[PDB]
Amino acid sequence: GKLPPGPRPLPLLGNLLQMDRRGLLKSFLRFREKYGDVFTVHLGPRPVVMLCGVEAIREALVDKAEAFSGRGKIAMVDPFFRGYGVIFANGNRWKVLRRFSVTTMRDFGMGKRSVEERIQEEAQCLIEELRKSKGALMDPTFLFQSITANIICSIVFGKRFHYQDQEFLKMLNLFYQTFSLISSVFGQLFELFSGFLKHFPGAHRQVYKNLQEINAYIGHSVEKHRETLDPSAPRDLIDTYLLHMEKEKSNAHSEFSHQNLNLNTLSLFFAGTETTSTTLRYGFLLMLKYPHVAERVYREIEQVIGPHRPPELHDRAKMPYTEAVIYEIQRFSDLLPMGVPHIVTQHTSFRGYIIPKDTEVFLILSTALHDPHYFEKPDAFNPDHFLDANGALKKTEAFIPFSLGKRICLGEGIARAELFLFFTTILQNFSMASPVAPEDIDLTPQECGVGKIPPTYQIRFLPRH
């Protein structure tokens, strides 16, 4: 009749003393054992409704999109974004920014390269760089960040950066450290108690600072643009927004403001860069632990593509095994285990409960991705989770690592193309080795909070001969 049941809170502490020391997600999975798929947790002073399992999540995001489509807060970054840019925006602002971002991430103007071609050229730059590494050990993080950030960069700024550019590396380093800090134990505590903790020093200050330092670059670049801007020939997403800006300048309430410009652009870069490269980091750790899988992908690339012709999107249809392996990397690596917080926009009835306007809601995507009815032994890495008996690709409704409904990842098409083309292009040209034997490889995440972040590891890329 009223909110969903959950553990009884204490006045200021909420459900703190019921939480699990290992983190928010562990805490929530234990509540689920007792309360089932829909339950309430008080995270300090706020009740947050948790939805688990694909059936509840889809009922909320799809069948009740008119109520579950608002965006809630990530406390570690709210002080910085303040509801600006498409990820953190609500109401009419979200509408405008979403429609703008969807269009400009897609349509580039006549003469411009498709998404596919941008990724294919980046892949060849990447392959060249790995040949130049000559089998040396590395943590591949920076390169995985380079290649994915360069995709968004080519759309937003109209250029890419060189792998050697230390100033590019420095921004990549700030994205990496920020995503870890946000996912750390402190950042999960900050989620319960930011009203109190914000008054003291902490990781929330370092994140804020990191973000402003990336934002300073974008402001500058915005200005260089607004200086060379030719209304007949827009070069990129920044010009295109400058032109909407000029068109609506007589409306003081125009959503096309400078703050939206900077923070929308920062959002696309942060999301475009950290999500994919984190998935690739996990993916190559997985190939190190399961070399028979990597050997079998390579066999499929030989047969379908060959050793030299560059992979293309058209090849996916014919490579069920590799597609299954990429799906399973995404499913197992469970990048955003609780998704990104939503917030209900109107008073609503859910499975007999009433959820008032403005209640925060977490969609625990991890529970769809590890659902034992769709994935036998869901805690093990196994590409067979996505294959039928005939070795044809088996897609399923439990695979929602981009979420669903109105707020579904807007980068989904790009991300999928990058995973496929980067992963296949690398394996076409290199096998992998490392000093750690497969049975000693530890897949345990280095952080698990808003993001699930793999540990660091060294790898060698060996040219095939």
Ligand X SMILES: CC1(C)[C@@H]2CC=C(CBr)[C@H]1C2
Site membership for ligand CM5, residue 149 (CB under 6 A):
yes
- What does the binding site for ligand X look like in residue numbers (CB under 6 A)? 77, 87, 182, 270-271, 274-275, 336, 340, 450
238 Cβ contact list (under 8 Å, min separation 6) = 156, 157, 158, 221, 222, 225, 261, 265
Looking at 40, 150, 260, 275, which residue binds ligand HEM (CB under 6 A)? 275
Looking at 150, 279, 366, 429, which residue binds ligand HEM (CB under 6 A)? 279
Looking at 39, 84, 179, 217, which residue binds ligand CM5 (CB under 6 A)? 217
Indicate the residue among 167 and 439 with the shorter CB distance to ligand CM5. 167
What residues from 259 to 298 belong to the interface with ligand CM5 (CB under 6 A)? 269
Q: Which residues pair with 71 in a beta bridge?
A: 342
What residues from 376 to 415 belong to the interface with ligand HEM (CB under 6 A)? 401-403, 407-411, 414-415
Q: Please say whether the dihedral angle defined by the alpha carbons of residues 211, 212, 216 and 218, taken in this order, is positive or negative.
A: positive
Taking the complex as a whole, how short is the minimal distance between the CB of residue 409 and ligand X, in angstroms?
7
Site membership for ligand HEM, residue 325 (CB under 6 A):
no
Q: Can you tell me the distance from the alpha carbon of 237 to that of 431, in angstroms, rounded to the nearest whole number?
A: 37
Binding mask 66-105 for ligand HEM (x = CB under 6 A): -----x--------------xx----------x-------
Looking at 182, 218, 263, 459, which residue binds ligand CM5 (CB under 6 A)? 218
Which option in ligand HEM, ligand X, ligand CM5, none does residue 274 bind, with CB closer than 5 to 8 A by kind? ligand X
Question: Binding residues for ligand HEM, how many (CB under 6 A)?
Answer: 26
Q: Can you tell me the distance from the alpha carbon of 355 to that of 343, in angstroms, rounded to the nearest whole number?
A: 10
What residues from 119 to 158 belong to the interface with ligand HEM (CB under 6 A)? 152
**Cα 35–chain centre separation:** 29
Provide the residue type at 428 as one letter: Q
Which option in ligand X, ligand CM5, ligand HEM, none does residue 287 bind, with CB closer than 5 to 8 A by kind? none
| Region of 16-24, 165-173, 224-232, 323-331 interacting with ligand CM5 (CB under 6 A) | 165-173
What residues from 293 to 322 belong to the interface with ligand HEM (CB under 6 A)? none
Site membership for ligand HEM, residue 268 (CB under 6 A):
yes
Taking the complex as a whole, how short is the minimal distance between the CB of residue 150 and ligand HEM, in angstroms?
12
Nearest to 457 by CA among 271, 289, 270: 289
Indicate the residue among 172 and 419 with the shorter CB distance to ligand CM5. 172
Which option in ligand CM5, ligand X, ligand HEM, none does residue 77 bind, with CB closer than 5 to 8 A by kind? ligand X
Cα–Cα distances in angstroms (integers) from residue 81 to residues 99, 120, 157, 435, in the given order: 19, 33, 21, 42
Taking the complex as a whole, how short is the minimal distance between the CB of residue 72 and ligand CM5, in angstroms?
25
Tokens of 401: 């690592």
Taking the complex as a whole, how short is the minimal distance between the CB of residue 145 and ligand HEM, in angstroms?
12
- Give the position of tokens 């034997």: 437
Known binding residue 448? Answer is: no
Indicate the residue among 25 and 197 with the shorter CB distance to ligand HEM. 25
Q: Given the rule CB under 6 A, which residues bind ligand HEM?
A: 71, 86-87, 98, 152, 267-268, 271-272, 275-276, 279, 335-336, 339-340, 401-403, 407-411, 414-415
Binding-site residues for heme sit at 409
